[PDB]
Amino acid sequence: STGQHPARYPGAAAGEPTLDSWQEPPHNRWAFAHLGEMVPSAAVSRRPGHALARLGAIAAQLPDLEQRLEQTYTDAFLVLRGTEVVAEYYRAGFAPDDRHLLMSVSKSLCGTVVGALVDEGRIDPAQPVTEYVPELAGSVYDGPSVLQVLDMQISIDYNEDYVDPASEVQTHDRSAGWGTRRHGDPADTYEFLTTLRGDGSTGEFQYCSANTDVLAWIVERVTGLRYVEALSTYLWAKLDADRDATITVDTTGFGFANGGVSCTARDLARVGRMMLDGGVAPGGRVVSEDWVRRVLAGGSHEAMTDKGFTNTFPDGSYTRQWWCTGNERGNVSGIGIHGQNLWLDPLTDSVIVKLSSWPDPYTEHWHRLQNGILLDVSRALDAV
């Protein structure tokens, strides 16, 4: 049993509607206005073939930048210097206002929502997860603090071999609706999280997507809002965004907080702008100045033992759902598989968004190419 969850609509029974009940009363009043949350759906365009390259300023210092973007399967790229868009690129077939999947850049948005609730005193990071989600008793999440979930410092038996359908990584996706369910799968993401185990040790970084979904569960328990709604109220609706974001949902309506947000490149940059503005956005303060300062400061370096990160960034770390390079520029980034970054360059007051579609989720070589672009662009923005 996974306990109480926010109803899909006011008055809804647990789990309702399902794919088999949404046409029935009382669900249909809600479902007829929200059917894409139940059934895959396509846009029918109101508007009736070529890459847009507006590299600006940086084009002089980086004359081969468009080629380097193509080589890293770039879909959308945008540089915000201060409040100004100073460079943009969109591949052929991807409009400037199209949305793109964020993959684990989504985690950095979830951490932001948690930080908002920490500022309000509704979450205390020193408390055990089970203070907020007692149904995680008996799992790997029984013992660790909320801060240890925020910093991903919990050892979890979570097989990352996605070729193997019995792996946790594939099971987590199927539980959330990203793949077709197999017999015996958990019914929804909450149930999947309660199956997770580990040896009980903490304090060493282990990147694991389940942690973010636990954070979103905590957000729901403390606010009584669907994660979809909390992500809007605590973050998205404060950005003065051009478009709504979207988030995939499982069969209970729970947003896939770790990986399923999509948004435009320009709107994602507004999240970075808020972080470089000390936590304030056009619609109000999102998170405290202290929370932003802790993100920029980094996590414990000794916890960071992922050589995929520290071979490039030897003084790197992770905190509060952000990767902290520890480099001489203090760069910090949200990162997601296949080449997604929300990269902060505080020295130049700039944000770089790069949304891509590498053929592979991760290789060392794609990361070397991608980080080389992000660092070159950051350096191109320095005063000279």
Residue numbers at the binding site for its own copies (CB under 8 A)? 18-20, 23, 25-26, 28-29, 31-48, 73, 75, 94, 98-101, 177-180, 228, 231-233, 236-249, 253, 255, 260-263, 283, 338, 355, 357, 359-361
Alpha helices in 90-135 (DSSP H): 105-119, 129-132
The alpha carbon of residue 86 and the mean position of all alpha carbons in its chain are separated, in whole angstroms, by: 25
Q: Least distance in Å: CB of 296 to its own copies?
A: 25
Strands 340-345 and 332-336: antiparallel
CA distance 190 to 250: 10
Q: Least distance in Å: CB of 274 to its own copies?
A: 14
148 binds, among Na ion, its own copies, none (CB under 5 to 8 A by kind): none
Residue 90 backbone zone (phi > 0: left; psi -120 to 50: alpha; other: beta): beta
Tokens representing 185 are 């799968």
Q: Least distance in Å: CB of 64 to its own copies?
A: 22
Of the two residues 186 and 316, which places its CB atom closer to its own copies in the complex?
Answer: 186
CA distance 50 to 64: 18
Question: Looking at 280, 296, 347, 369, which residue binds Na ion (CB under 5 A)?
Answer: 280
288 binds, among its own copies, Na ion, none (CB under 5 to 8 A by kind): Na ion
- Count of residues that interact with Na ion, criterion CB under 5 A: 10
Note whether 254 and 133 are within 8 A (CB). Answer: no
> In the window 47-106, what residues touch Na ion (CB under 5 A)?
none
- How would you label 167-190 residue by residue, b for 16+ Cβ within 10 Å and e otherwise? ebbbbbbbbbbeeeeeeebbebbb
Q: Least distance in Å: CB of 20 to Na ion?
A: 8
317 annotated active-site: no
Of the two residues 260 and 316, which places its CB atom closer to Na ion in the complex?
Answer: 260
Q: Catalytic pick from 1, 21, 104, 350?
A: 104
Please state, as a whole number, how many other Cβ atoms lie within 10 Å of the Cβ of residue 339.
Answer: 25
> In the window 135-174, what residues touch Na ion (CB under 5 A)?
173
Note whether 354 and 266 are within 8 A (CB). Answer: no
> In the window 170-229, what residues touch Na ion (CB under 5 A)?
173, 179
First to last CA, the chain: 60
Of the two residues 115 and 198, which places its CB atom closer to Na ion in the complex?
Answer: 115
Strands 322-324 and 317-319: antiparallel
Of the two residues 40 and 184, which places its CB atom closer to its own copies in the complex?
Answer: 40
Tokens representing 93 are 């077939």
Please state, as a whole number, how many other Cβ atoms lie within 10 Å of the Cβ of residue 18.
Answer: 13
288 binds Na ion (CB under 5 A): yes
Of the two residues 43 and 60, which places its CB atom closer to its own copies in the complex?
Answer: 43
291 binds, among Na ion, its own copies, none (CB under 5 to 8 A by kind): Na ion
CA distance 242 to 97: 8
Q: Which stretch binds Na ion (CB under 5 A): 45-53, 72-80, 110-118, 332-340?
A: 110-118
User: Active-site residue numbers?
Assistant: 104
Per CB under 5 A, residues contacting Na ion are 115, 118-119, 173, 179, 278, 280, 287-288, 291
